[PDB]
UniProtKB/Swiss-Prot annotation, chain A:
It comes from the Eukaryota. Belongs to the RNA polymerase beta' chain family. RpoC2 subfamily. This is DNA-directed RNA polymerase subunit beta''. DNA-dependent RNA polymerase catalyzes the transcription of DNA into RNA using the four ribonucleoside triphosphates as substrates. It comes from Spinacia oleracea (Spinach). In plastids the minimal PEP RNA polymerase catalytic core is composed of four subunits: alpha, beta, beta', and beta''. When a (nuclear-encoded) sigma factor is associated with the core the holoenzyme is formed, which can initiate transcription. It is found in: Plastid, Chloroplast.
Amino acid sequence: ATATSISLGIDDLLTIPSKGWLVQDAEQQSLILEKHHHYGNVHAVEKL
Amino acid sequence: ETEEEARKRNWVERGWAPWEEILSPEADFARK
């Protein structure tokens, strides 16, 4: 465990590549539903 | 009272009136 050695930097915290799309798509549905919630399409419980 | 005089109370006193609502097809589906 010494000769090989290990350490924690900043680029070793490797976020999975697809997070860029999943979070963006999750935001879109939260934007659309919160925009229709002001139109009366859905009620408070459905938004929650 | 029953819904023949209590409904009458809303109209004569509180100005109630069943104005029609123009619901969009997305909002129409929600109510039905």
